[PDB]
């Protein structure tokens, strides 16, 4: 494990080859999750890019957070996508949380500490525990098949994951940077493998 606190992975160039793979102590397939992230990129005005790619042997794009140039955010589980439209956007470090639940199908997407509308997606699905989690790229195949035109150029960190949908109160505690412990992916106790020209540098955001 490494304490990545106050450091972030910086992706200065567009390539298919720069990524970092994160290893999770998963065992049972997920019935719910939260991922919270912090990232800065200027690409949002120019093209779509992968913010968080989760893939499994049976389903590439098993969880994905993406930006679509003309549309805003999109969220995918189990190969099925919902939009979270954001037509006017500003360049700054953005914190987000996504959370999803199999029992309800309800998707919550939080942007810079405010929820979007609670949506619905993939009610009843189950997410594979043999996950290739990749930062910096979108996966067309388990652990690979990256597309350079979908890579992130920018800076990503404070990536945390839970086995469960956080409360609004808990998402607010995380956004304000109070003390919390994630139980599926923990930024202070991270297990990861960097490849290509990726650098670890002190974070731009507070």
């Amino acid at each position, epitope marked *: *494990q490494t*304490d990545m*606190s*106050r450091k972030a992975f910086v992706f200065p160039k567009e390539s298919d080859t720069s990524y970092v793979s994160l290893k999770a*102590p998963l065992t*049972k397939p997920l*019935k*719910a999750f939260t991922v919270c992230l912090h990232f800065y990129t200027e690409l949002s005005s120019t093209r779509g890019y992968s913010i968080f790619s989760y893939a499994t042997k049976r389903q590439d794009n098993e969880i994905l957070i993406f930006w679509s140039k003309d549309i805003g955010y999109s969220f995918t589980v189990g190969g099925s996508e919902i939009l979270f439209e954001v037509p006017e956007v500003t360049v700054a470090p953005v914190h987000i949380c996504t959370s999803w639940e199999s029992a309800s199908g309800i998707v919550e997407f939080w942007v810079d500490g405010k929820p979007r509308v609670r949506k619905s997606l993939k009610k009843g699905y189950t997410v594979g525990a043999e996950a290739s989690i990749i930062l910096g790229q979108e996966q067309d195949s388990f652990g690979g098949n990256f597309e350079g035109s979908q890579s992130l150029v920018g800076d990503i960190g404070n990536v945390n994951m839970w*086995d*469960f949908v*956080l*409360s609004p109160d*808990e998402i607010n*505690t*995380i956004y304000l*940077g*109070g*003390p*919390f*412990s994630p*139980n599926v992916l*923990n930024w*202070r*106790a991270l297990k990861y493998e960097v490849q290509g020209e990726v650098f670890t540098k002190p974070q731009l955001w507070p």
Partner: antibody
Amino acid sequence: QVQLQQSGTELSKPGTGVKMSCKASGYTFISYWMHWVKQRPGQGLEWIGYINPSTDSTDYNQNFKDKATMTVDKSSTTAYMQLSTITSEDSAVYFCARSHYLSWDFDVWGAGTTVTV
Amino acid sequence: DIVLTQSPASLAVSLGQRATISCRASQSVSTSGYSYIHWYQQKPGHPPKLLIKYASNLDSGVPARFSGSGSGTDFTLNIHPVEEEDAATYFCQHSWELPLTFGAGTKLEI
């Protein structure tokens, strides 16, 4: 009031198994993890694991991953721990404790169940 | 996993004085100014009572003589004035990762 009430002392033989309960009361059982922790008589503390009642999901100290099995009943706010093929080395007080499921401080504790093997 | 090594094993204190109990983590357990260390009091025959959370946050219903401190690998619990009620055994715990671990404890003796 917020409290945890456990099932009380279990007496058992080598090669048996015991299941001890932890009734939570006075709070929303779903909003918290239940932790379980061992204490040998006069010696230390030994964390067993947790259960998330919201997701029915558990993790264990690697010394217990084949000894223990945690479960909950959400219909009656009762946590359990089952101890498998218990042996004299398993004789201890076993406490259940709450934590707010983001922060792993053990906020409130049950009285403990003595198991004498 | 994180070892917490805790010192001294027991502590003899007059009423009215100061008890200082120390805990060493094998790792830094501070990030972003918080530190994932917790202190409990257990009286014999009772379950532990949380005293201090995150090295220094005094829990509600705890007297002001209890005051935790520290950062990084090195943490302490002070009791001052140490008082007859404080005849107890004290444990540090971390919240940094799984598994959660406890210190061996210290017993405070008048």
